[PDB]
Amino acid sequence: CPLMVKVLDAVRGSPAINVAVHVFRTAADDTWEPFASGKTSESGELHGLTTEEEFVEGIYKVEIDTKSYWKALGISPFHEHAEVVFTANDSGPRRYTIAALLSPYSYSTMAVVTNP
Amino acid sequence: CPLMVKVLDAVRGSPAINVAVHVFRTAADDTWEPFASGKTSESGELHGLTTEEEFVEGIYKVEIDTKSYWKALGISPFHEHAEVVFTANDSRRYTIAALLSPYSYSTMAVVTNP
Amino acid sequence: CPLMVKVLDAVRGSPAINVAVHVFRTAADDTWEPFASGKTSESGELHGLTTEEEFVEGIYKVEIDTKSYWKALGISPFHEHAEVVFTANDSGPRRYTIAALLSPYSYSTMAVVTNP
Amino acid sequence: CPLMVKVLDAVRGSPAINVAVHVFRTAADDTWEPFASGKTSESGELHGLTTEEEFVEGIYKVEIDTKSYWKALGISPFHEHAEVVFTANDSRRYTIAALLSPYSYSTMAVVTNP
């Protein structure tokens, strides 16, 4: 898969399960248009968001819905969500893994980009 | 100073100097509208963005212009910018820090009571 | 495997390949004794360090040799290595994944602990 | 102040207060020996560990006693402590920061010239 999202919970030391993820792409009029969405699995991973055909060059935003995640665990966190905004596929198709490590008042995000 | 932003560079072990930072507030039509902006100083900090009177409860976004910072250094980065989106709550000082690398960033909020 | 180490390079956006990892365990005289070692693969992962039988309760240190990694890429980094020190298996056997995200003047480390 | 240590708590969004910090230097027999120590202040910082005269080039270790910090808050942590090992080089001020969570930490070094 050309786009995978992995989310981990730094309070529990576990995958962050059932985290909602929304992906948008910038349109020709420079607005964000819905591109794909899903929820992380028991492994903290979200696969199957898109295909190589559909994932053309563009500016993408991966929105990870961290506030809803934390609230369900009894934590009122600082952020509304974690946002990851990047140009994709501007040098040809790549595979992207976006990882996010979550705490209530912090997060870290890292991308691994590979050429298939 | 109810809101301060600090940006650090994890490639060079330094403050991230002259980084543009833009703050937005959510308007009634649920759109983002410009609220304040500036560039980080030689210590990587940006003070004086807003005042207590102006910084009312609401949802804000801080957008740190990391791509241009890395381009100026000749380093290829992943992200267009870093985004920190949060609600201000009167329930008193917010420090938003961001630690920047070319393909990763970490952001932390310190919320303290004067 | 009960102990796995994963290392990523935040400058390149890639797995950190051929990173040396040394694991130690505290001995009865409170000194660090060699426990296992290896190098990360092309995926940034190091498997096969130990077995469930050998990985008894104890205090362990995973030493990730980050300075040698960076120097080979032309970077003189800040740290000598990244150290991860933890009690393991004190509530019965667990599986541990230790991840480290590396930059020249920073690193992040996260553990995922699961019960098999 | 050639060496400062700052510790932050990512669960509460605050400085990490009253955290014990121990600094070691490598001795000639390649063993670690105590060099300096203290506890972080209400701002999460620890100043005054050493002096310019004393902080000569060499390999140092900073060990932040995170387990006891989390135990006092009633939170189960992963690590015994956080360790930052580095060489001091005369090639001038070191700030070591650590952002703490129960199963993760991030550490950053800012090296600046006065």
Attribute tags:
homotetramer, 116 residues, mainly beta, five-stranded mixed sheet, four-stranded antiparallel sheet
Please describe what this structure looks like.
The structure is a homotetramer. With 116 residues, the first copy, chain A, is mainly β. The first copy, chain A, has one domain (1-116). Chain A has one helix at 66-72; strands spanning 3-9, 14-15, 20-26, 32-39, 45-46, 58-64, 79-88, 95-103, 106-114. The radius of gyration of chain A is 14 Å and the shape is globular. The A-B interface holds A 59, 78-81, 83-87, 105-113 and B 59, 78-81, 83-87, 103-111. It is classed as transport protein. The entry lists the keywords Gatekeeper, Stability. The assembly is tetrameric. Crystal structure of human transthyretin double mutant K35T/T119M.
In one word, what is the shape of chain A? globular
Gyration radius from CA atoms of chain A, angstroms: 14 Å
Largest pleated sheet of chain A: 5 strands, mixed
Structural class of chain A: mainly beta
Can you count the helices of chain A?
1
The helix/strand order of chain A is EEEEEEHEEE
Which chain pair has the greatest contact? A-B, 19 and 19 residues
**Oligomer state of the chains in this structure:** homotetramer
Number of domains of chain A: 1
Q: How many beta strands in the DSSP annotation of chain A?
A: 9
- Please give the share of residues in helix of chain A: under 10%
Strand content of chain A: over 45%
GO cellular component, one term (chains A, C): extracellular region
Modified residues (Sulfocysteine) (chains A, C): 1
Modified residues (4-carboxyglutamate) (chains A, C): 33
Binding site for L-thyroxine (chains A, C): 6, 45, 108
